């Protein structure tokens, strides 16, 4: 029975293959067929290319050796290479053109999801070209999805030498009959077959996957669209900044490029952005996913006033100061969404661009007390229930698993009434003791939230709702302003509290506002519709945040 | 007696002042004298500019109000503004041209060093212009050096209103006669004087500093060249990455731009780069200063083999993988310098550029055992003393303060023999019990190293020297290679072990090698000659690492 799947890189996980460009170049330059492929393999195991693949020499050292082989081959074939003939130019273009073979990667991802050990085994080189970063990026993206990456230039062995296959088997800790090995080079398949491994000769991806599906008995073709890559908390870089003596802020950090600061809502975590973190970093951004004040590994002081918007915003500015960041793009959800609009209003110099999921920008009404305003809309009753210190803490802390399982549900799964929370005595009075697991979350994801909330509970988080008067007074100072920096408002069709219609007057305050809208999306936007969130954010970041 | 110094921003800490550009524009466009300055102040406390300075409106909202005032003023003066007249263009240029008044900042820095509380008090605006980052950067650089920053647009008050001066005094927790206040606007000085503060009307910086020196009795002009900005450990962003189950790497992080990974030597810390961290981040780089494996907050497993170059380099590659970085520039010192050359040789795709301080690149000699090679040069005897597990640990751990005070000394202060360390029975056998403090370090800096080494001691650090055979075998695999990526070798004139002459054959292996050389510099390069190190690294980074 199979338990391991091994994939080649060139022509398998990445397309188009380089040997294809050797042929394509021959045809474009009208050179004899096979001339470049012949000069590339010249000397066989004793040749320049084998030395390169074994890591004896670098790619830049190899380039003139290939040029000499090309001259030798042309002399014998009684032809002339063109005037502007350049091996460097040919390989730069080929490497740059090679992209991840997305259906092959998805199949590798599905096999690993079903318990397979996966590896990439590749004949590759030590790339020291000025343009080497393109390939470093491709390898980085690919390698994260596999248990092992075995590179010929690191191990000093190449396919089709028998020892590299023995090295592979030892690395996998598997017998040959337990392995499926995919390669586009027939000669590189022979030793794996001779050892007793299941082998697939990859020409077109579709046929290769049909063979792979047949042999593993796992559906790989025609599958439902997969979710984006998520985060394993123990594999992330964890950052910590002291913003003031008693307050430290925790964040998770991934990628390079313009800083993108993600601000979660209530009662959440940096982990609420798990589906966005890998995608935004892959899109070319340095992601900083916060544990907002009162949450996770960030400090949670007990005082109400520590959670007013003015204090929270000041602390986020200090956070940027201590990291040496003059700006960040601020993306918020729920309470995080409210905070980011206020960052844009009070600290526009520090905000590269601003985006909110669900939370609209609504200016303070200077002619009405904030308590009066909240009372006017019945959907906001939960916010009145959250007022009295200790009441909501007791209900939410009673059974953490029940709390998160009852809260984190899709629009067509909610056990929460929301109407008359105070009158009914709580949010969960008509909710089961042992809620079913929502289709959005796994038990493991629920337990992460349970583990995080064991540290500080719900006091700090609830305090975000306990500064209505304080926030109203501060917000009133901004009434003559407009938000004129790049801005995006993302509405969720099925958020029954933060309804899309509530955002309708935003253009009055944010004339250049851009929008996104997610159909069949509830309150927990990032985990409800991660693919759609990623598409909207990446498109907006690339056009408006640079 | 004075204990607080307050500085204005425009025309005091930053030059040239904006009001100067209003005058300069008038002259360039041959407009009536004072026309633009008059339209700028139009309406006094009731005008557009006061509203802007109080934070009622943003800079982008203010621009058309200023345009209207300019039209009104021109109509009255019976003149016409030019065809291409633009307030936005005038202010963008002015803000962009304004730079930090370096001698004023140095004086503020000296006063704070001598126990003064320092603050910036400024009439400023909420900047939402597309080009706002330039100013966000300037404010960031400036604010870090002061106890307080009071901005008119945040507090809703402006100079010369009396309340802002009362707010300042309350913020400083000081009586008026205890404050010296510097401003380039005479009208903005009057309320501070009326309260009883010492005031200085800033025209030219030199005269302002003479007045400031006279009143405080502290030398501010003609001072010796100050050291670069250092790091306060509790004010840094601290990062943590698990590279494998039992190994976590700690780093300090500052700035934005291309990733620059700093790798210290033996027996050091991320803190050895304290003078480089702020300077490189200010130069436009994202600095990652490591605690190398075995040190500080990084893991320190006991096994010798955990510290061989192959393992250390693999872990640094995983470190990049987990942070989502395809490359970093690697800068090393001592053992860190050896590691970075090997990163360049084995992982060139992951190394944007490579630099070493003191440590030359010397290829393995395949015809001689590494132990034989070390024996040939008497200056390397300390490395033989470090071989036997437990011997050097006992001496180095006996008295941490004595260890660091004896080690960290300039070339003309060393109590260390280095000749016949084994024979004499130790490095400190002819060293005092209570060494004097070297001119390079403070007692506080020594205690930081003492505190760090209390966690794991010297086993992990010494193990870096205990892999001669293992490193020699691995290094031999790279003998056919050349380092062809951007590289810098920095020699230190007075390093008596890693002598400049030892680097003389490097061009044979690194043909495109760039060099730096520091006169009167010992082994502890970063703290010995921080200004010179900063100059060399920044110049090389900007030309070769992008
Ligand atoms: C955040 N929160 C805490 C307790 C209850 C909520 C909460 C807040 C909302 F905006 C919202 C909801 C719950 C549902 C799912 C009903 C919805 O459709 N919108
Ligand atoms: C790093 N180290 C640990 C114990 C002793 C040293 C050590 C290493 C050196 F390369 C070196 C020195 C000490 C001095 C200061 C003599 C010098 O000029 N060069």
To the question of whether residue B10 is assigned a binding role by annotation, the answer is: yes
Nearest atom in ligand 2 to the alpha carbon of residue B266 is 1
CB contact under 8 A, B235 and A481: no
Under 8 Å between Cβ of B267 and B455? no
* Residue bearing the CA closest to ligand 2, atom 9: B497
Both tokens of residue B155? 């507090």
DSSP letters, B342-390, are: HHHHH-GGGEEEEEEES-------TTS-HHHHHHHSGGGHHHHHT-STT
3-state SS class at A465: coil
Under 8 Å between Cβ of B200 and B226? no
Element (H, E) at A255: none
Q: Among A333, A382, A393, A422, which residue has the most ligand 1 atoms within 8 Å of its CB, making it the best to mutate? A: A382
A250 is catalytic: no
Nearest to B128 among A281, A323, A485 (CB): A485
CB contact under 8 A, B481 and A259: no
Q: Which of B387, B360, B391 is nearest to B468 (CA)?
A: B387
B523 is catalytic: yes
CB contact under 8 A, B327 and A51: no
CB-count exposure of residue B470 (10 Å: 0-12, 13-18, 19+):
middle
Distance CA A503, CA B364 (A): 68
Residue with token string 């005092």: B432
Tally C-beta pairs within 8 A across A and B: 153
- Judge if the upstream peptide bond of residue A267 is cis by omega within 30 degrees of 0: yes
Task: Enumerate residues 6+ apart whose C-beta is below 8 A from B485.
Answer: A128, A132, B344, B348, B351, B352, B353, B354
Nearest-Cα residue of chain A relative to residue B479: A56
Q: Which ligand is nearest to the CA of B360?
A: 2
Domains of chain A, by residue range, sit at: 1-16+97-217, 17-96, 236-546
A512 is catalytic: no
Chain A hits for B321, CB-CB cut-off 8 Å, are 140, 143-144
Chain A hits for B346, CB-CB cut-off 8 Å, are 126, 154
CB contact under 8 A, B349 and A133: yes
Could you tell me which CATH class the domain B1-16+97-217 is placed in? Answer: alpha beta
Nearest-Cα residue of chain B relative to residue A56: B480
Structure determination method: X-ray
One of B250, B264, B333, B523 is an active-site residue; which one? B523
Nearest atom in ligand 2 to the alpha carbon of residue B409 is 15
CB contact under 8 A, A349 and B136: yes
One of B127, B183, B334, B544 is an active-site residue; which one? B334
Q: How many Cα atoms sit within 13 Å of A231 on the Cβ side?
A: 30
Both tokens of residue A243? 């913003």
Nearest-Cα residue of chain A relative to residue B350: A136
To the question of whether residue A10 is assigned a binding role by annotation, the answer is: yes
Q: Which of A403, A405, A408, A379 is nearest to A392 (CA)?
A: A403
Distance CA B270, CA B240 (A): 13
Distance CA B497, CA B485 (A): 27
CB contact under 8 A, B140 and A480: no
Task: Enumerate residues 6+ apart whose C-beta is below 8 A from A523.
Answer: A334, A358, A411, A492, A495, A496, A497, A498
Shortest alpha-carbon distance between residue A294 and chain B (Å): 19
Distance of CA B385 to the CA centre of its chain: 36
Under 8 Å between Cβ of A10 and A20? no
Distance of CA B237 to the CA centre of its chain: 14
CB-count exposure of residue A184 (10 Å: 0-12, 13-18, 19+):
buried
Q: How many Cα atoms sit within 13 Å of A137 on the Cβ side?
A: 16
Give the Å distances, CA to CA, from B336 to B266, B312, B352, B358, B522: 8, 10, 16, 10, 16
Q: Which of A527, A203, A177, A239 is nearest to A357 (CA)?
A: A527
Under 8 Å between Cβ of B179 and B192? yes
Nearest atom in ligand 1 to the alpha carbon of residue A496 is 18
Task: Enumerate residues 6+ apart whose C-beta is below 8 A from B469.
Answer: B369, B370, B371
Q: Which ligand is nearest to the CA of A464?
A: 1
Residue with token string 């962003």: B237
Both tokens of residue A349? 């110099």
Distance CA B484, CA A109 (A): 36
Mutate which: B237, B291, B327, vs A, most A CBs within 10 A: B237
Mutate which: A56, A253, A256, A546, vs B, most B CBs within 10 A: A256
Under 8 Å between Cβ of B148 and B119? yes
To the question of whether residue A8 is assigned a binding role by annotation, the answer is: yes
To the question of whether residue A275 is assigned a binding role by annotation, the answer is: no
Residue with token string 């597990």: B389
N residues, chain B: 546
One of A275, A295, A523, A544 is an active-site residue; which one? A523
Residue with token string 């498109």: A539
Distance CA A214, CA B424 (A): 73
Q: Tell me yes or no: is domain A236-546 CATH 3.40.50.300.
A: no
Our CA angle for A113, A115, A120, nearest 5°, is 80
Our CA angle for A452, A453, A454, nearest 5°, is 90
Under 8 Å between Cβ of B304 and B467? yes
User: What is the CATH code for B17-96?
Assistant: 1.10.150.240
One of B465, B495, B528, B544 is an active-site residue; which one? B465
Strands B286-291 and B259-263 come out as parallel
Distance of CA A469 to the CA centre of its chain: 38
Same-fold call for A1-16+97-217 versus A17-96: no
Task: Enumerate residues 6+ apart whose C-beta is below 8 A from A533.
Answer: A275, A276, A357, A490, A518, A525, A526
Distance CA A90, CA B101 (A): 52
Shortest alpha-carbon distance between residue A320 and chain B (Å): 9
To the question of whether residue B8 is assigned a binding role by annotation, the answer is: yes
Distance CA B127, CA B155 (A): 15
Chain B hits for A128, CB-CB cut-off 8 Å, are 348-349, 483-485
């Amino acid at each position: 029975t199979l338990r391991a799947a091994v994939f080649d890189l060139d022509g398998v996980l990445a397309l188009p293959a380089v040997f294809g460009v050797l042929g394509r170049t021959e045809e474009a330059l009208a050179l004899p067929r096979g001339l470049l492929n012949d000069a590339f393999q010249k000397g066989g195991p004793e040749g320049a290319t084998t030395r390169l693949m074994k890591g004896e020499i670098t790619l830049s050292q190899w380039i003139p050796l290939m040029e000499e082989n090309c001259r030798k081959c042309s002399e014998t074939a009684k032809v002339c290479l063109p005037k502007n003939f350049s091996i460097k130019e040919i390989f730069d273009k080929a490497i740059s053109a090679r992209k991840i073979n997305r259906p092959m990667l998805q199949a590798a991802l599905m096999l690993r999801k079903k318990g397979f050990t996966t590896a990439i085994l590749t004949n590759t080189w030590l790339d020291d070209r000025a343009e080497r970063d393109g390939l470093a990026q491709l390898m980085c993206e690919l390698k994260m999805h596999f248990d092992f990456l075995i590179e010929s230039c690191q191990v000093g062995m190449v396919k089709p030498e028998p020892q590299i296959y023995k090295f592979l088997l030892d690395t996998l800790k598997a017998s040959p009959s337990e392995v499926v090995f995919l390669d586009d080079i027939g000669a590189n398949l022979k030793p794996a077959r001779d050892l007793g491994m299941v082998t697939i000769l990859v020409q077109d991806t579709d046929t290769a996957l049909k063979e792979l599906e047949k042999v593993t008995g796992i559906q790989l073709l025609n599958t439902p669209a997969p979710l984006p890559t998520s985060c394993n908390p123990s594999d992330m870089s964890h950052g910590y900044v002291t913003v003031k003596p008693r307050v430290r802020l925790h964040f998770v950090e991934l990628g390079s490029g313009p800083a993108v600061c993600l601000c979660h809502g209530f009662p959440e975590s940096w982990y609420s952005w798990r589906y966005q973190i890998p995608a935004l970093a892959q899109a070319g951004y340095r992601v900083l996913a916060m544990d907002m004040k009162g949450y996770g590994e960030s400090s949670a002081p007990p005082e109400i006033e520590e959670y007013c918007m003015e204090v929270l915003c000041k602390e986020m500015v200090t956070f940027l100061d201590k990291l040496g960041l003059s700006q960040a793009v601020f993306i918020g959800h729920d309470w995080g969404g409210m905070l980011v609009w206020y960052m844009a209003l009070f600290y526009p110099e520090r905000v590269r661009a601003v985006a909110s999921l669900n939370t609209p920008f609504i200016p303070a009404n200077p002619n009405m007390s904030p308590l009066e305003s909240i009372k006017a809309n019945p959907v906001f009753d939960y916010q009145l229930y959250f007022q009295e210190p200790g009441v909501a803490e007791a209900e939410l802390e009673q059974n953490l698993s029940r709390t998160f399982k009852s809260l984190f549900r899709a629009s067509d799964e909610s056990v929460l009434s929301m109407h008359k929370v105070c009158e009914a005595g709580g949010l969960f009075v008509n909710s089961p003791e042992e809620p079913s697991l929502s289709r959005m979350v796994t038990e493991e994801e629920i337990q992460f939230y349970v583990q995080q909330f064991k540290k500080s509970g719900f006091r700090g988080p609830l305090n975000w709702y306990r500064n209505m008067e304080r926030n109203w007074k501060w917000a009133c100072k901004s009434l003559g302003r407009k938000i004129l920096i790049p801005a995006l408002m993302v509405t969720a069709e099925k958020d029954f509290v933060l309804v899309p219609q509530m955002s309708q007057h935003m253009e009055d305050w944010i004339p250049h506002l851009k929008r996104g809208h997610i159909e069949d999306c509830g309150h927990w936007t990032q985990m409800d519709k991660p693919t759609e969130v990623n598409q909207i954010l990446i498109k907006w970041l690339d056009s408006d945040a640079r």
